[PDB]
Subunit: 248 residues, 3 copies
């Protein structure tokens, strides 16, 4: 028996777009502590972790640790048609084969109910990278997203370069070469190594949809490792993406 | 020698857009009691009747009664180039092959004049049902339009249920099942008897575009009777759609 | 070498859009006088001539006459991602095979540096054919844009017709037959005789994007001659297009 009402559907909408950019279906892992979604893309290069804590909701009910597999195509299609400022209640009854979304005004004059069939999705091996990072940069989410889009005019690969002065995103291709250089303040570096890696812009792109959730974004880098980009969802959750670097 | 100056060309623009949704060509019945298009889609399932009473125009003139066949696709292309806040005089002359649109500024500094070829179109041998309709509902025209587009994510068929409590719009398909319920008395339901019919969303869709003319819309129903959907062009005319239900 | 710095990159963004419509590569002739593109379209029917004068730039060094072949496609692609409000400094060091654009933020938190390869651009065939222009006509550049967009629904050839009263742009095609007349209101016609040319609309449309650089535009005509359409950039240069008439 589960029931998670949220005040403003804005949140669910912005979130599902965010994880849908990375995967078609995923398991909604619901505990008394909150909804969790963990998922890897089909090329096993990059990973989403999303937590929404119990207090993120107006009302949250999850005695048992039930799981829900959900088609994020259908889910996304449906959230599309739900007003930003309407309330949205996700509920699964005791052994139904469908989850239900349920939507109302502030003023109760219109009520929408949608039902989605669930799916056996084999929960994956996957594995959050277990490391700690000796380099962290925080910056404006929207600026971040613009920088990936920028770099894409050049390549499929951005080269990030943290130093104590600031980060230096670079890229190359037929069009030419470009970099965008950032300076500390603005940007918040916390480095202890001239550490500089390369990544797939396709994914950085996908991750950067995170700016719909959070004015700021933190990137984290350990030498030769899966970087992390984190989007704080208020103080009541996070969106976390981990991506493998390109290596020789 | 027809002549028909509307004053704000928006009306003609917003109208043709609507009716063009349903049909590529249409005869304009031009009496001294106004203009009226009557027409069926090619799948002979859905009907438009629009009348602009002669009080509608700041200049009307139709001694005789003429029919004028028009390619609406071409009439639409010309009308998308016409500034909503301009004069728009229509005009046909005796044995003339061509009708003539003519726009002017408020401040008489810009004259535009287009010229379209008439068609011969076979006169329509279905026209109106002439029905009772004792079941009625009236709701904000944009919500109606939002709703048909919403229901379209689920299926090609909307099922409309009317009780005195309200009006439920339901739909089913691959994605899931959806419904949108509206409360009564903001919706003015008023029925004699509780009934529920089903319809092709394609056409409901087409009809909904009427939301650009009237802020409110009126639906009327009857058991195994082509429903009607009506849009008052304020008090100077109407646009009216009729659609066959889907029975088993 | 050459340095040229603009205060607001808006200018370059808006210029390269205009001239890229006509040709995908051009030579920038650079003097102490200023930057200067001059280029024909590949059918030798239309000619662009831009001048950015030395005072257009906050900073402009160019000791000797270098000539730079640039790929306007690529430049366009880069400039699309430069912010309007950032500055843009364009340098080239004398044996370098590369031009380099640099973009700083007013508050110095962000610096961007893109670099493009030069091209050996063979054709500088050229030849600004000045003649004595009898008739002039000057009008709001957006209206002119709009008029050609409109004339395009009819045909691919506009006939401009200039007289005491004003000017009549007309066109014909499968859709029908339109015209647009502008009274001498502003609209400063200032002719000597009646005069009626016709012109490819494709090109007129390419030209009409100049409306992003100048609230007004000016057309000059001469019997059996190329027209000129000029857009002035402040008092610091011009963009000037020349188009041959259709005769037959």
């Amino acid at each position: 028996m589960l029931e998670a009402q949220v005040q403003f559907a804005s949140l669910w909408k912005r979130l599902v777009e965010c994880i849908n950019g990375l995967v078609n279906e995923a398991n909604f892992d619901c505990n008394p502590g909150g909804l969790s979604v963990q998922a890897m893309d089909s090329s096993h290069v990059a990973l989403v972790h999303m937590l929404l804590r119990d207090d993120c909701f107006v009302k949250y009910q999850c005695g048992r640790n039930s799981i829900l597999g959900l088609n994020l195509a259908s889910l996304s299609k449906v959230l599309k048609i739900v007003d930003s400022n309407d309330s949205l209640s996700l509920r699964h009854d005791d052994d139904s084969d469908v989850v239900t979304l349920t939507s109302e005004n502030p003023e109760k004059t219109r009520k929408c109910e949608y039902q989605l069939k669930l799916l056996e999705i084999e929960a994956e091996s996957m594995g959050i990278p277990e490391m700690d990072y000796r380099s962290t940069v925080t910056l404006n989410s929207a600026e971040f997203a613009k920088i990936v889009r920028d770099m894409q005019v050049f390549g499929d690969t951005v080269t990030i370069a943290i130093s104590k002065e600031g980060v230096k995103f670079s890229s190359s291709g037929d069009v030419g070469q470009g970099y965008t250089f950032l300076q500390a303040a603005g940007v918040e570096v916390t480095m202890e190594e001239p550490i500089t890696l390369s990544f797939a812009l396709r994914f950085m792109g996908i991750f950067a949809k995170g700016s719909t959730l959070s004015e700021r974004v933190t990137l984290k880098f350990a030498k030769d490792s899966p970087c992390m980009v984190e989007y704080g969802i208020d103080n009541v959750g996070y969106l976390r993406y981990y991506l493998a670097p390109k290596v020789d």
